[PDB]
Amino acid sequence: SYARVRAVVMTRDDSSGGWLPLSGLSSVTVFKVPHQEENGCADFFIRGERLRDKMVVLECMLKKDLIYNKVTPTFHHWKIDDKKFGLTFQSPADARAFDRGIRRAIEDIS
Amino acid sequence: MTEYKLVVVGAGGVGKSALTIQLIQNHFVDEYDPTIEDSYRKQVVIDGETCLLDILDTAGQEEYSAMRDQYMRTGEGFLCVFAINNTKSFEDIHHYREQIKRVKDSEDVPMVLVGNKCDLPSRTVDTKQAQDLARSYGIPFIETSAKTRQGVDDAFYTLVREIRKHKE
Amino acid sequence: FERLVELVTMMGDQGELPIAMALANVVPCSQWDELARVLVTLFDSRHLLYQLLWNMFSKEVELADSMQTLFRGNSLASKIMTFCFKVYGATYLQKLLDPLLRIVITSSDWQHVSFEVDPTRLEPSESLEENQRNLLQMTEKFFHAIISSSSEFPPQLRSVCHCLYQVVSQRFPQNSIGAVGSAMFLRFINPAIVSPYEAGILDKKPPPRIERGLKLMSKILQSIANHVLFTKEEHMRPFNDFVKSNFDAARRFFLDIASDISDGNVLALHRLLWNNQEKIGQYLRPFDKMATLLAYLGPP
Ligand SMILES: Nc1nc2c(ncn2[C@@H]2O[C@H](COP(=O)(O)OP(=O)(O)NP(=O)(O)O)[C@@H](O)[C@H]2O)c(=O)[nH]1
Ligand SMILES: [Mg+2]
Ligand SMILES: [Zn+2]
């Protein structure tokens, strides 16, 4: 993986008017799936599973034009067209390392 | 050297490309890449005469049937290929042969019936069936296997001999 | 009315579609071409098109030996898919390809445009380097018009490709989008590119020099869709750099279309039904119920 932290996934509620957990603490990973050969073009994803049951709670597909807002330390959110997703981290060191992972992941999109 | 324009026809998945590659490049392709139209050329000696083989690999997918009028118009010999584990494939040869005759405006167009994939242990078209169908057509029948390279030279060389008898 | 097609569209528990699946495995292969026409029009008339596609597509992937055998060759489900592309994307292809084709014929007939890139077939007067450029230019704007056509993709197909996307993903979750895009190009886009007249896009066949270029362009476009380099014909290798760069541009277009009518002719469905009715119950309620309607409504 490009980065691996433990955080709570956030989703903005339009009826609530703010960000809320999607209900658990998850391990969020950034990885690539090769299109053909392992050392070739690939797709990039953000994936998070709740630690209690290893159930996926968020799965994205990284894009070059993706905007990644870092409004406060230990809190990051982005946009995948209609839907909005976010993350709150347990420490800035985990938030900085997760930002470095997806920054290099977009650099490897091609 | 005289040019012999060969054309490979048949249903999709019978092994038209796999048979063509084993003749040209002498190796067996394990992948399934459905073709549109491929062209090849090979020089060889048959019965002592050195000649060029202009080989045309056609599309077995039925969506590309509108291309059949052209390669049947310019082709000289046709290698009708079917798979012995696909009974459908066996009966499709008819509709290819009828269109060849119609565009050639002839009842005697040289062609060979080829039953491919003879390496498999389960076959839905046994040998005596294809022999009787070839007698109905009046053309030779040859069993081939693009995997083990059995009869691949025999199938292509025999089609050339049918074009020689026709030219005389 | 005494005409009950419900029995055909009846769904068992777990959405079995018992009558159609039994009818699919017993009807001769000759009538497969119209059986897809009968079932698609009927289920679409009752807003059950997705149920028919979900059942037939599932059976294909289920019995397919590997991912490269998937929906290659002509089976009933393969006929159903091409029919849906036909009846829903005819206006889509027609308005997309016709402008580019008229620019290739009416314009550019002024010069001696040649797309011949096979050296052993090339006239001495023409140049290989020049014809190679001519092919890539035409292939480029054709490929660009297809990738940029996401906002004009009709919704019925977008439902067909997404339905095809999910069913294969159950057995091949890795790179399942590739199977959608290849069948999309192989069975829908490219056949109309090679033969525009027969597809109903043009009024007459293009000149012979254009027909050779369109055939070569569809070979390149298919390599891009299949995400495979040219490895057979030595004269198509010079284009490998072009197809290697446009791999993921088409992959993005496939990921786009794969993510979310007056019934006519008074189909003699019962004529299709009773001709193949013999021994429908070779399995392993409806057949008994069906026999009463068949006995009352005698075959025509
Ligand atoms: N066991 C076995 N498999 C074979 C043989 N010939 C071809 N195949 C398999 O048949 C499949 C399709 O082969 P291919 O040559 O692409 O068939 P095709 O006639 O080219 N199809 P298309 O008409 O679309 O071009 C591949 O899986 C190939 O490995 C053979 O002799 N034995
Ligand atoms: Mg082939
Ligand atoms: Zn790629």
Side-chain angles (χ1 to χ4, degrees), chain A residues 1-49 51-54 56-102 104-109, chain B residues 1-30 32-127 129-167, chain C residues 3-20 22-24 26-58 60-65 67 69 71-169 171-268 270 272-275 277 280-286 288-292 295-300:
Chain A
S1 61
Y2 281 58
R4 194 158 182 162
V5 306
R6 330 193 83 168
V8 191
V9 57
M10 297 290 151
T11 175
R12 160 145 174 172
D13 194 313
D14 273 303
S15 70
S16 303
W19 293 89
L20 283 180
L22 188 135
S23 308
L25 171 72
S26 299
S27 61
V28 188
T29 56
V30 180
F31 55 98
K32 73 175 186 183
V33 173
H35 289 176
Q36 277 290 353
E37 306 92 352
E38 315 297 324
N39 48 26
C41 43
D43 290 328
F44 303 90
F45 310 100
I46 305 185
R47 180 195 183 104
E49 323 173 69
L51 299 186
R52 53 175 189 275
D53 45 3
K54 317 196 304 263
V56 299
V57 299
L58 168 63
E59 220 172 28
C60 280
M61 201 185 218
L62 292 186
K63 303 188 175 186
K64 278 201 299 178
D65 68 329
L66 170 57
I67 57 175
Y68 185 70
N69 317 103
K70 306 184 303 177
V71 285
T72 62
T74 73
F75 172 59
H76 294 153
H77 66 76
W78 57 86
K79 195 199 224 290
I80 67 106
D81 286 353
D82 43 332
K83 293 185 176 182
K84 298 189 175 186
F85 298 135
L87 285 174
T88 63
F89 302 84
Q90 290 188 26
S91 150
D94 288 0
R96 301 192 215 97
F98 191 86
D99 179 29
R100 301 182 303 106
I102 76 172
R104 295 315 188 108
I106 299 187
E107 182 179 66
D108 284 5
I109 285 187
Chain B
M1 300 177 297
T2 58
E3 296 187 11
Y4 295 138
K5 312 187 195 306
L6 312 184
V7 175
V8 185
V9 298
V14 308
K16 295 186 295 297
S17 298
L19 281 174
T20 299
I21 292 303
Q22 276 278 26
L23 181 69
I24 300 302
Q25 305 176 7
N26 212 294
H27 73 88
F28 178 56
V29 282
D30 205 288
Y32 187 158
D33 185 16
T35 54
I36 306 180
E37 212 174 75
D38 294 351
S39 175
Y40 303 91
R41 175 174 296 278
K42 175 176 181 175
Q43 176 220 58
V44 81
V45 289
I46 314 171
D47 302 328
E49 169 187 275
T50 312
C51 57
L52 301 170
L53 295 191
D54 194 325
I55 296 177
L56 196 52
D57 191 12
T58 58
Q61 220 72 7
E62 292 188 358
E63 291 79 2
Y64 301 98
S65 66
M67 308 186 308
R68 294 175 181 173
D69 178 280
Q70 202 180 245
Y71 70 72
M72 291 168 177
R73 177 181 312 276
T74 52
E76 293 176 347
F78 299 91
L79 208 61
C80 299
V81 183
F82 74 94
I84 68 175
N85 64 338
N86 182 16
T87 39
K88 176 73 175 175
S89 172
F90 186 53
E91 297 167 10
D92 280 75
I93 300 296
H94 177 99
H95 299 74
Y96 278 108
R97 178 170 156 269
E98 291 305 312
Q99 186 177 7
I100 295 171
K101 300 194 221 163
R102 185 198 317 151
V103 75
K104 287 301 190 185
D105 200 8
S106 170
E107 286 288 321
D108 176 21
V109 164
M111 57 181 75
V112 171
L113 191 65
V114 169
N116 202 35
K117 300 184 181 177
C118 286
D119 42 299
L120 305 177
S122 73
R123 44 188 317 163
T124 70
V125 187
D126 69 325
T127 309
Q129 277 172 71
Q131 290 175 333
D132 297 350
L133 184 67
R135 281 186 270 272
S136 168
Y137 300 165
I139 65 176
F141 165 69
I142 301 175
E143 288 192 314
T144 66
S145 174
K147 193 183 187 67
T148 64
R149 222 191 176 271
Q150 165 205 331
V152 53
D153 289 307
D154 187 13
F156 279 94
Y157 293 162
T158 297
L159 177 58
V160 175
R161 298 190 179 97
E162 293 296 323
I163 308 174
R164 289 175 176 178
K165 301 179 179 181
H166 179 273
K167 285 170 69 177
Chain C
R3 296 293 142 108
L4 298 60
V5 311
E6 331 208 304
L7 294 63
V8 168
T9 73
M10 188 179 315
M11 308 180 57
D13 305 0
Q14 291 76 232
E16 305 168 6
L17 282 183
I19 299 310
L23 193 64
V26 307
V27 160
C29 295
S30 171
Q31 299 182 280
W32 279 2
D33 207 49
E34 202 192 47
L35 180 61
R37 161 178 174 259
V38 169
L39 293 188
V40 166
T41 297
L42 195 72
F43 279 70
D44 189 20
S45 66
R46 291 167 160 260
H47 303 94
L48 308 184
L49 192 156
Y50 201 97
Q51 303 310 123
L52 176 61
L53 292 199
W54 173 268
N55 269 135
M56 292 314 306
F57 291 173
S58 299
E60 264 299 272
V61 180
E62 168 187 342
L63 60 84
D65 307 359
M67 185 163 180
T69 308
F71 280 90
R72 302 208 198 273
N74 302 94
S75 182
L76 178 54
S78 311
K79 304 273 187 176
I80 295 176
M81 180 194 298
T82 309
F83 186 92
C84 292
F85 293 152
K86 162 192 177 301
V87 75
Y88 297 137
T91 315
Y92 167 69
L93 271 188
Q94 201 276 345
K95 216 207 177 187
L96 172 64
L97 303 179
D98 183 291
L100 303 178
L101 290 171
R102 276 191 280 169
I103 297 171
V104 164
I105 302 174
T106 289
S107 297
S108 71
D109 78 325
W110 304 77
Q111 297 174 335
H112 191 220
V113 288
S114 175
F115 307 89
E116 237 316 321
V117 304
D118 193 336
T120 66
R121 300 272 203 270
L122 184 57
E123 288 278 87
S125 53
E126 295 160 8
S127 174
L128 179 42
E129 57 181 359
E130 171 195 78
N131 292 358
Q132 285 178 333
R133 300 198 332 259
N134 288 336
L135 199 38
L136 287 196
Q137 306 306 133
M138 188 180 67
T139 309
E140 174 158 275
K141 287 307 167 185
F142 259 79
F143 180 74
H144 174 73
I146 296 177
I147 303 307
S148 306
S149 59
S150 171
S151 55
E152 281 91 316
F153 211 75
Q156 278 85 346
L157 295 182
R158 195 178 293 264
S159 173
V160 172
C161 303
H162 172 246
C163 176
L164 173 67
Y165 184 30
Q166 287 296 323
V167 54
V168 55
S169 304
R171 278 193 60 177
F172 314 101
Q174 184 168 346
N175 298 312
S176 48
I177 185 61
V180 167
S182 69
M184 164 68 178
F185 258 99
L186 177 68
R187 283 186 165 93
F188 179 52
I189 308 290
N190 279 155
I193 290 181
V194 178
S195 306
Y197 171 76
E198 295 83 338
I201 293 185
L202 287 179
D203 301 358
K204 63 166 172 289
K205 311 183 196 179
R209 222 130 48 203
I210 306 300
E211 292 185 311
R212 176 63 179 179
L214 300 178
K215 182 202 303 178
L216 292 164
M217 182 177 66
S218 71
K219 300 170 63 64
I220 298 172
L221 289 174
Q222 194 64 211
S223 266
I224 296 179
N226 306 342
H227 204 278
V228 179
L229 299 173
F230 283 113
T231 48
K232 286 182 181 170
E233 313 164 78
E234 198 69 29
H235 65 284
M236 302 297 291
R237 282 181 179 267
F239 311 109
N240 275 338
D241 279 354
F242 182 86
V243 314
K244 193 186 187 66
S245 63
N246 293 338
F247 275 164
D248 308 330
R251 171 125 173 172
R252 287 185 286 266
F253 176 82
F254 301 148
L255 289 163
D256 187 296
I257 60 170
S259 75
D260 59 328
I261 171 179
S262 81
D263 181 12
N265 306 153
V266 198
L267 288 321
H270 63 335
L272 204 166
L273 251 189
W274 187 263
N275 294 2
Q277 170 272 349
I280 47 167
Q282 64 84 59
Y283 44 83
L284 285 60
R285 330 103 288 271
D288 198 332
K289 184 66 174 300
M290 181 185 295
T292 290
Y296 185 94
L297 298 182

